Design a protein around this ligand. Sequence first.
Ligand SMILES: CC(C)[C@H](Nc1ncnc2[nH]c(-c3ccn(C)c(=O)c3)cc12)c1ccc2c(c1)S(=O)(=O)CCC2
Length: 169
Amino acid sequence: EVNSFSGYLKLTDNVYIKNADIVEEAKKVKPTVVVNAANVYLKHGGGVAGALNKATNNAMQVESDDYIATNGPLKVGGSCVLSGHNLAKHCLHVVGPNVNKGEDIQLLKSAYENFNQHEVLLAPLLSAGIFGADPIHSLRVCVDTVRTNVYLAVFDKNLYDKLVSSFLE
Ligand SMILES: CC(C)[C@H](Nc1ncnc2[nH]c(-c3ccn(C)c(=O)c3)cc12)c1ccc2c(c1)S(=O)(=O)CCC2
């Protein structure tokens, strides 16, 4: 079965959310597109990007290095489409702003806009965690910006509960 998302809570007609690890979701669901929370040089050194690369046994990093050699780095708020490997048909590498490194939070709208070129996506909460954005603000930007169908996997039950409570106010 295609895009077999299970156990999500529907927030709006096009945004769903689950307390789950995106890597485990990508193995179970086999989505058409999995979003990576990338950096501009596609160096998958930790967090979500490191976990998705490790699940591909480093095939994602080798492919990413070859892409950067030919095309140069991405811009903050930009994206590229590369192979999904064993995790998805395609990986959409999206660069949200890293507020902890001084990048502009306004670029988070441009980052989510990349999602609208794909009908269905499995994605993480952009710019949250160590990128420093307020995760409740990142969910609000996602809901207001994404028009295609997006399944958000957030690997922390405490944050999940705060995000669902905030949306339902
Ligand atoms: C907010 C947080 C709960 C969320 N975390 C995650 N959300 C969804 N699936 C996840 N898998 C893992 C994971 C991490 C270690 N290892 C070993 C794994 O195997 C699997 C993390 C994780 C998240 C959302 C966005 C971003 C980050 C973190 S960040 O800090 O990586 C910087 C980039 C933006």
